[PDB]
Amino acid sequence: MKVGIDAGGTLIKIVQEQDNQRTFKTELTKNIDQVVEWLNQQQIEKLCLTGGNAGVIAENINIPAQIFVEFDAASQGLGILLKEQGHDLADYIFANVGTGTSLHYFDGQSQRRVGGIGTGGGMIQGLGYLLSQITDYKQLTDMAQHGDRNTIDLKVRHIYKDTEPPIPGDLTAANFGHVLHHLDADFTPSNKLAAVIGVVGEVVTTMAITVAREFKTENIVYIGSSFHNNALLRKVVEDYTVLRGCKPYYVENGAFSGAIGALYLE
């Protein structure tokens, strides 16, 4: 058994490999203690680590472990999964949408971090909590799928009324920009949660299409756990990427890219 772990701020991603049979496992970072305990019981041929909490794991385990930088690990695991799933992309931006978001340009051989932003999954949970008092992730994200953004968000055509706008009128002009025109409306947790995701989705995508243009690629690969159980977040990201003339790609087990990469390095 060989093992790769991407110990992030919110989720611990574990890949076990055994005779080319692969296991994909998630555990909360909150429960890192139980991950360490599990590890100490196992017969492990090779253990590779990455992410911010790799150190916490490495210190509390009884066996050696190689530790890799998460940007390189994610890039390598993602290329392994892109190949396996029939994509041969000469180059691409990838947007690792986790607790926060890191953006990368892969030129065909290697990656470079070209930006990042703190709009990501951690904001969906945290701001989500402030607007709804829901702490359970599944519940939070389910509820948001049932949401309407029209009373909350302001569109380019809302500002330009009956004039020809100088950019497409369906574009979001101001996230939460309509709230003050609907104070005679009672803002439901679904609507509000849909608008949190709405803004997170549009910020990530905008950043991604911008660096796609800068590094002269049309391919944008979206990964990270922020997409699990959140179809609304995919749709927002997908629709807008397309609107901007770029190809969006999701990846089966994209959130484990870092755990896989750690396995297939050095």
Ligand X SMILES: COCCCCCNC(=O)CCNC(=O)[C@H](O)C(C)(C)C
* Cβ proximity to a copy of itself, 16 vs 200, nearer residue: 200
Give me 86's structure tokens: 């029939």
Q: Evaluate whether 153 touches 177 at the Cβ level (below 8 Å).
A: yes
| Partner whose footprint covers residue 170, from a copy of itself, ligand ADP, ligand X, none (CB < 5 to 8 Å by kind) | ligand X
Hey, which residues between 73 and 132 contact ligand X (CB under 6 A)?
Answer: 98-102, 116-118
Hey, which residues between 35 and 74 contact ligand ADP (CB under 6 A)?
Answer: 51
Q: Whole-angstrom Cα distance, residue 228 to residue 19?
A: 28
- Taking residues 114 to 133 in sequence order and writing x for each that binds ligand ADP by CB under 6 A, - otherwise, the string is -------xx-xx--------
Q: Evaluate whether 147 touches 192 at the Cβ level (below 8 Å).
A: yes
- Look at strands 92-97 and 101-106 and give their pairing: antiparallel
- Could you give the dihedral angle defined by the CA atoms of residues 105, 107, 111 and 112, in that order, rounded to the nearest 10 degrees? -50
Among 170, 182, 235, 245, binds ligand X (CB under 6 A): 170
| Beta carbon of residue 183, minimum distance to ligand X (angstroms, whole number) | 21
State the first-to-last Cα distance of the chain, in angstroms, to the nearest integer. Answer: 17
* Cβ proximity to ligand X, 80 vs 173, nearer residue: 173
Hey, which residues between 214 and 253 contact ligand X (CB under 6 A)?
Answer: 240
Does residue 201 interact with ligand ADP by CB under 6 A? no
- What does each C-alpha distance from 245 to 165, 209, 212 come to in angstroms? 20, 9, 10
- What does each C-alpha distance from 50 to 3, 27, 40, 45, 201 come to in angstroms? 11, 15, 18, 17, 26
Give me 165's structure tokens: 């706008």
Active-site annotation holder among 17, 37, 70, 202: 70
Does residue 202 interact with ligand X by CB under 6 A? yes
Q: Whole-angstrom Cα distance, residue 125 to residue 185?
A: 24
| Beta carbon of residue 129, minimum distance to a copy of itself (angstroms, whole number) | 5
How many chain residues interact with ligand ADP (CB under 6 A)? 17
Residue 151 counted as an annotated binding residue: no
Query: Comparing C-alpha atoms, which of 181, 184, 200 is closest to residue 131?
Result: 200
Among 4, 77, 79, 224, binds ligand ADP (CB under 6 A): 224
Which residues carry a binding-site annotation for ATP? 6-13, 99, 121-125, 137, 225
Q: Which residues are catalytic?
A: 70
Q: Which residues bind ligand ADP (CB under 6 A)?
A: 8-11, 51, 98-99, 121-122, 124-125, 137, 224-226, 228, 255
Q: Which residues bind ligand X (CB under 6 A)?
A: 52, 98-102, 116-118, 156, 159, 167, 170-174, 202, 206, 240
